[PDB]
Design a protein around this ligand. Structure first.
Ligand SMILES: *[C@@H]1O[C@H](CO)[C@@H](O)[C@H](O)[C@H]1NC(C)=O
Lengths: 80, 49, 99, 274
């Protein structure tokens, strides 16, 4: 499936509205350095490591010739 | 590229039912009994597994 | 999401020929709230048509009531014509004394 | 019976036609008693029911200012949600908020509501427990987590279980004449030959308030749920309601069909036989 998923980081902080920033999820790092992305903010470019493999397996059999999935990141604070 | 081999054995009789080499172009022995195989990699990503 | 209006055309009281009455077109369950409604007598548009304020339902849809005084009689047809963003062309629903 | 109080706020953007139009309404049992409209000549919260508890023009001015502030807030929220959903600045979008409380016949709370929807689709709603929220989108989840951190459900539950019920009881006590009346339906059955071997029996219930009525056809004393056509309850236009239920019957067998009517006005359910 896709090697990278383009994602939109949505700002949680109040007063920022819902401003979106570009980001990427590099699912498989692979040997060697990742594809350079100077356009992305370094914090929003994420090399994903999945011990359970649910995400990796979900996007390893993704149908070929299919539209790019709609991804959105946000900051999370664990609450009960 | 890899090779896939399907053979039968029964009562002292053996047949090469199917031979394929997905990812490599070459002449394979004709498949027997109209058999086909879904022989392919699930993806063409540059890095394994 | 957009919802088509649902239209009912009826009278305030059971119709009696020669008796003054009100003809109501009740439009309900449409979204967004922009809607055009006319009451037709024999096709022509009735001028003095009143209506209630735009109302709000618990399920995020809107409804309206258009009423006009009339005296039902035979040979006179009345219908409600409704135009909404969800309708390719205006929909006219006929008035039957028993519906 | 079971009464309710609802407050609706709706902001509808009108691109190229001025600022968004804001409307605020209050209902007791689907009966309007206050209305603010920005398109009005003199934007002001105006009573629409004589049974309301009027408390001087100062209170009305305060409510007008409150609703103007809510209008500004809803304009800002409309712009924010239009930006988030990647929608053009040419279309028209609406933002709706609804909060209120339902109360039983004994004046005890049953269900409090505080919901927001965007373009007619649920955006974020307070759950029945009055503790958690339901949010499907990422922006809705951001606001949900903000509120959960801020403990907004606590204040909302305190209001819904408190002032909401108190004001609903006060309105119902000031409006016994209308809000707490029960007009029984006027019922009659009509016959329409629909074919050479079938007819239609229609049961009409007219002029009944409130709108909670039940009409049911029974064949040989048993329910006839199959092929029983209904129309939605509709306003007669004079504070009452109309409804009818139709069934299709073999010709000559109409004597074996009974219409059953249940309404608060009726001391006992009515049985009609054409
Ligand atoms: C909005 O949609 C357009 C059209 O597909 C796209 O080019 C653009 O990146 C989208 N913007 C955002 C912020 O998602």
């Amino acid at each position: 499936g896709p090697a990278v998923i383009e994602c939109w980081f949505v700002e949680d902080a109040s007063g920022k509205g819902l401003a979106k920033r570009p980001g990427a999820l590099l699912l498989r790092q692979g040997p060697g350095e990742p594809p350079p992305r100077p356009d992305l903010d370094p914090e929003l470019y994420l090399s994903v490591h999945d011990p359970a493999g649910a995400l990796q397996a979900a996007f390893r059999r993704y149908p070929r010739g299919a539209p790019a999935p709609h991804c959105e990141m946000s900051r999370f604070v664990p609450l009960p | 590229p890899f090779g896939l081999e399907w053979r039968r054995q029964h009562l002292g009789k053996g047949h090469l039912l199917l031979a394929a080499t997905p990812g490599l172009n070459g002449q394979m022995p004709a498949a027997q009994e109209g058999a086909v195989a879904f022989a392919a990699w699930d993806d063409d990503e540059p890095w394994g597994p | 999401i957009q919802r088509t209006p649902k239209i009912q055309v009826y009278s305030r009281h059971p119709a009696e020929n020669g008796k003054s009455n009100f003809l109501n077109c009740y439009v309900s369950g449409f979204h967004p709230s922009d809607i055009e409604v006319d009451l037709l007598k024999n096709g022509e548009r009735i001028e003095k048509v009143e209506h209630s304020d735009l109302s709000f339902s618990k399920d995020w849809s809107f409804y309206l009531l258009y009423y006009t005084e009339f005296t039902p009689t035979e040979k006179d047809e009345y219908a409600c014509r409704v135009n909404h963003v969800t309708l390719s062309q205006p929909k006219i629903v006929k008035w039957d004394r028993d519906m | 019976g079971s009464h309710s109080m609802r407050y609706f706020y709706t902001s509808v953007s009108r691109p190229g036609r001025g600022e968004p139009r804001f409307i605020s309404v209050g209902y007791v049992d689907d009966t309007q008693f206050v209305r603010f409209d920005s398109d009005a000549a003199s934007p002001r919260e105006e009573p629409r029911a004589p049974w309301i508890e009027q408390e001087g023009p100062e209170y009305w001015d305060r409510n007008t200012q409150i609703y103007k502030a809510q209008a500004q807030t809803d304009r800002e929220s409309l712009r924010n949600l239009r930006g988030y959903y990647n929608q053009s600045e040419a279309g028209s979008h609406t933002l709706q908020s609804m909060y209120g409380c339902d109360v039983g016949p004994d004046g005890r709370l049953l269900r409090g509501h505080d919901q927001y929807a965007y373009d007619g689709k649920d955006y974020i709603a307070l759950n029945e427990d009055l503790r958690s929220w339901t949010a499907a989108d990422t922006a809705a989840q951001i606001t949900q987590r903000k509120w959960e951190a801020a403990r907004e459900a606590e204040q909302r539950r305190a209001y819904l279980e408190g002032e909401c019920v108190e004001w609903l009881r006060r309105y119902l006590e000031n409006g016994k004449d209308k809000l707490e009346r029960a007009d029984p339906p006027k019922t009659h059955v009509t016959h329409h030959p629909i074919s050479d071997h079938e007819a239609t029996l229609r049961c009409w219930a007219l002029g009944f308030y409130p709108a909670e009525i039940t009409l049911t056809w029974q064949r040989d004393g048993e329910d006839q749920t199959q092929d029983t056509e209904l129309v939605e309850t509709r306003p007669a236009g004079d504070r009452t309601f109309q409804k009818w239920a139709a069934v299709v019957v073999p010709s000559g067998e109409e004597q074996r069909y009974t219409c059953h009517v249940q309404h608060e006005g009726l001391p006992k359910p009515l049985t009609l036989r054409w």
